[PDB]
């Protein structure tokens, strides 16, 4: 029902068809098939038609052929039936579906002549030897593609043929792998590269597959992302092609001087919907307006590649002196080699954006306002205050705070700096070598104002920072930051959910779990905790067409439930059709689903009227008799599943936390340390719920006991109000 083609239409003006490139497609994939199909014969004559055929390290037999048509390729003779359809699909008529039929029976046929290939591989023999990978194995698609899908990697560059010098390839790919697209390396391109002594490999996601066939190994690799990551059945073509289309955002660089074969596999990457563009001029009766082009100049060509796919990059090269990468951001500066810490030991510390008017300031304006880092001995500590000021033409105070957490992130992306917490909060600290290294303040507010103008192209223009550190200056405008932070969050305590009338869905976990869909209201968080109400809303206003939407509030059905028909209709529209009510107040009856990055689970125990919870971080058994990964593989994955439920923490603490199902009075069992950590919120709504003051301490954990049978006397002595509640069965 996809209707996947429909992506094509307007390409081609009616009877103006490219018949020059459709001759060569059609030679191609009858080439490509004829060679897939001796080669096959041989293999037959050779081991016998029921001899083992496959790739090393993969679940999904030969991934191409699994994933468009289904079959599960195990011996030589699976692979005699294929061939014939293939062949059978290759139609001589100039159309471009018959050209698109073509690329995918090309692609068909490079999948079994490279399986026929490892016919001879063992690994105390291997076909692949270094610096090649040949095919790559699945825990790399793991590994790697789950950032592919979820656009963590921009894009991903099928590189065919060789550019037109070593330094030329050089260029291209330096600026592609800097730009962190993945790169799928064929053919003499892999040797122009290496004589530039360019690094590659899978630890830089720049695989040298090989020559000719073994360009294969991008295709099978990308499909796997939708046999493994879109959970799409096998032979559902239109179905993985539309997955290609959405969600991997390759592109085909077809370099070098053009042959038959390199063409027809390149219209099968049209087939599955990713554009070529090759350096190559071409006539007008050999190219396709969106699909197939020229590009010559290589100091344009990566530019229009990425404008053909719909790639949009934020990275920008900058002068530093020290390497700024994304890697790092784990790193922490110990205590054994701690150097200048600020904040944490009321020493002041402080940091805040904040919008501002247009002709008032400049761009580019970075200040560093007292002493640098150049004033302490190893172990030191100084007070540390920011300020960041944005002008944007579409620019609001709404963005203020989402701009705020990001610095945390920023200031990590680099070696040496280390910061966690926010606010007044702010943790800053810096490691001994980087200021052994030589960078100081002037080049980390650099930094901020770099990625500040990288990630949010469409709103932010004109920005500056401006650093301070005398430890008083530093508290006067701590004191001001207070006031914003207090107009934020007064703004945030005015939010109820009948004070709006628009939720917002995410989508952003359907990388993972793609029938899972969030709808944040604002008295339940995300159940990831990281996404509010707010801030699904400003990235709605800042990006549109995110994965972030309005929903109002139409057709209600259930006022106790909290069912509306928008939000039936739209998580239906975005669950493949497979949830069709979903109630926002209650986890007994159509509760919102979950992907697998929940903070808690929440399950009812009819054995003591009420519902346990239990914290990701909480290893012990729990009263339903499972550890919360076991709860985890059954709530997790989009599924509806009544009776059990994840959450953000601190859903735990709103107003309307299941408040169809009794609210906060349900809750029987939790761990020891999750309720101490959520004492003070617990303990507020307790007290305006008329449950006392005292009520937390008749919650069950686990010192009381880890079953239901050593719970139950404990939750009688205490008088729980549960147990005098209507069973929710
Ligand atoms: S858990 Fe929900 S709100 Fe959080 S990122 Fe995933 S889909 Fe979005
Ligand atoms: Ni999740
Ligand atoms: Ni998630």
Redesign the pocket.
Known sequence: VINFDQIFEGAIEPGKEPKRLFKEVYEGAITATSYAEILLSRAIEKYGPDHPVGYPDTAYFLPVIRAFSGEEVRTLKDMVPILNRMRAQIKSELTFENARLAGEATWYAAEIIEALRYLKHTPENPIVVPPWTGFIGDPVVRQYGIKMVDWTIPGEAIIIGRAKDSKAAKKIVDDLMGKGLMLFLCDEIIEQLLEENVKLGVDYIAYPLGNFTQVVHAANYALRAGLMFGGIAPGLRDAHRDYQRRRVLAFVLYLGEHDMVKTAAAMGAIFTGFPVITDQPLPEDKQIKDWFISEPDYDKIVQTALEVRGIKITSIDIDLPINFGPAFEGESIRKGDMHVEFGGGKTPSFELVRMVGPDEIEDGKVEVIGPDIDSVEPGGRLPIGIVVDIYGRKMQEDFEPVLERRIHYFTNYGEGFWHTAQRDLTWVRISKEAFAKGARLKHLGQLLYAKFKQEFPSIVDRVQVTIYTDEQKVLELREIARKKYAERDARLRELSDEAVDTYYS?????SF?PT???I?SPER???????SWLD?KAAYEINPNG??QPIPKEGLIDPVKGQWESFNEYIYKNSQRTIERMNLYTIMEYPMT??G??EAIMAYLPELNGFMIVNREHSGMTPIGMTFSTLAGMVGGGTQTPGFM?I?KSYIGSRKFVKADGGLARVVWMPKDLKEQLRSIIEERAEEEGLGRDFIDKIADETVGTTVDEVLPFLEEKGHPALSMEPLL
């Open positions: 995410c989508l952003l976990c359907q779990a899972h869909v969030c944040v968080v995300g159940l990831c905790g990281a996404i699904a994965p972030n979950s992907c990055c929940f994840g953000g």
